[PDB]
């Protein structure tokens, strides 16, 4: 389907913001955000994105926490201000 994609530094700098607003937690596990882009064209293009809280469990690895309401609200307002960009997929900062 998609031969190649285009990733802008803005989202990785948003990950830098994720490492910014931490404020010395003592947890600092993997954080799952929501990536936005254009799936209309064959080549994927990333403009901007937002962040959603994501938490897991120490022992059990099957634990994952997301939010439907916050996602629909953020994507709703983002679609309200800009209709040129929609949802595509997600990303995590975990090395593994």
């Amino acid at each position: 389907a998609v031969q190649k994609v285009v990733v802008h530094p803005l989202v990785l700098l948003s990950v830098v913001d994720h490492f910014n607003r931490i404020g010395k937690v003592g947890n600092q596990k993997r954080v799952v955000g929501v990536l936005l882009g254009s799936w209309q064209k064959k080549v994927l293009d990333v403009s901007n994105s937002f962040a959603v809280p994501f938490d897991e469990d120490d022992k059990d690895d099957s634990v994952w926490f997301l939010d439907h309401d916050y996602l629909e609200n953020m994507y709703g307002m983002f679609k309200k201000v800009n209709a040129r960009e929609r949802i595509v997929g997600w990303y995590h900062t975990g090395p593994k």
Binding site: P53, D55, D57, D60, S62, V63, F65, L66, D67, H68, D69, Y70
Partner: protein
Amino acid sequence: MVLESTMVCVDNSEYMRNGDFLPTRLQAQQDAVNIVCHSKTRSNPENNVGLITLANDCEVLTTLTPDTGRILSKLHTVQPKGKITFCTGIRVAHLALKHRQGKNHKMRIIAFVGSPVEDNEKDLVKLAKRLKKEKVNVDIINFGEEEVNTEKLTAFVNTLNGKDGTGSHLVTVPPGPSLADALISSPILAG
């Protein structure tokens, strides 16, 4: 008023549709959720109610919100698959209690169990020790049964329940023609 969070777990299995007991009591306990959430609305409307099932794959239908308007619409499409799950069903709620808006709200989680527990006594007493450690209110409600009602469940509740004074209560409903509404409305946990 009273500031607390409400977490309700519904059974999506086919054991609720059995012909001996109530004719798909899922709708009845749905109406129970309706009247208790409307009761909480009348008392303290600022409380939020989340919804998730006991199945293998945990999927939140509606995030905790003070408005039950869309929740009533999300009460449908139960997706009758899977059988039962316990541990991750607890870990998907009690650990997710930190995602609430108000930090002044107390932690309260209930459950509707229509299927036999597949987990041994070890996991039970361990998870009970965990819930007792983090001190979260838990109300055990079991609709329908196959084997004996309370055997290890008694010791389970006793070990899970701390602070004997004004603590949690156990709800045990036998077979009968009467509904589950006025029956679960008997303790102080409802209304």
